[PDB]
Sequence to fold (387 residues):
Amino acid sequence: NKLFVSKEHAPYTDELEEDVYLDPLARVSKDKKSGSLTFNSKNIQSKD
Amino acid sequence: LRAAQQQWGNDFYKRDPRIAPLRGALATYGLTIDDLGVASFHGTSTKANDKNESATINEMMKHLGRSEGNPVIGVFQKFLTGHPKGAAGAWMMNGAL
Amino acid sequence: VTREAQIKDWVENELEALKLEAEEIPSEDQNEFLLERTREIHNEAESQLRAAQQQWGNDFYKRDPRIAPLRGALATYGLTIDDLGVASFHGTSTKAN
Amino acid sequence: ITLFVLVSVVEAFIASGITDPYEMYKYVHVSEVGNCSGSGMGGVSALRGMFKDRFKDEPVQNDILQESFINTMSAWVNMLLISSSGPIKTPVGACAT
Amino acid sequence: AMAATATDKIGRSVPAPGKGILTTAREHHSSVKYASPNLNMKYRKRQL
Fold:
């Protein structure tokens, strides 16, 4: 009875929300610790 | 011909990630970020909405490389007409025109 | 395919122009310039190819008044009017509807 | 109605194979995922609350109006599952919505 | 010239506003050492 999994948090933190909004190429990655898909500062506004 | 004009005159920035939608819309007509001289704010006269909207416009202006000392002049129309629950953006559009 | 031929000709023209510009610019900051301009040219070439594909594959019928929206939508994928074999009716169970 | 919509969105993503809605953000920007669904009448339960239960002074939550909007279902979908900052366009079409 | 809509993020407040429409200014600045020719109007008219 857990088909609906409410997200407790957005994929970006409050401090990184603006950066994610302003970067069109920002994409989520799997966090090694939490294991969930989240935005990473290293991946935001990166030449890669 | 219209496809070429769309590609080079209207939608030249849809594909480019280095051009924002706002900057591209301005530059379609030769304007720049600094040419966006007026901002019809929602201006609901509430704490959260006004602070959030001012922050949003400020962040747009920062990221789009607006010249320092060139603030957008904010127009708050709901001080006079109040806040309708959906005619608001239409009244602000009329005022902007 | 004619449009793709023209697009590749345009791409190699712009590449030779970029090569001349790279010859002009000092070699100190040549790598970043080349990377930025190569990405820009790749984006432009992709945009042009998708524009041609939209013109001849997707929106070939938007301009033609002899092709209905329905017939054109069917013919985009090689189908015909007769290939519309099923109609999910509103079917409200009311006389007028 | 909002519960039905949440279940339908989750099941639709399951049918799409997207078990984690954030998997979309590996491929598109948060601004590139929209929700354009809507209702003909919206939260009629919340409308009945605000119009009748409040008139009768029965216990009604102070946010029954935000629960009554037609776009509230899409808002709850986005802010329980999607987190997208993409286009949101809630239509009303009665039976054709 | 432009018209766009946006949502904010995952939360539990319908009337809470957010920075969702900040995406209308989303831009990538990892490599902006040189101006894009695509943003120059003379270049675009040449292509046209």
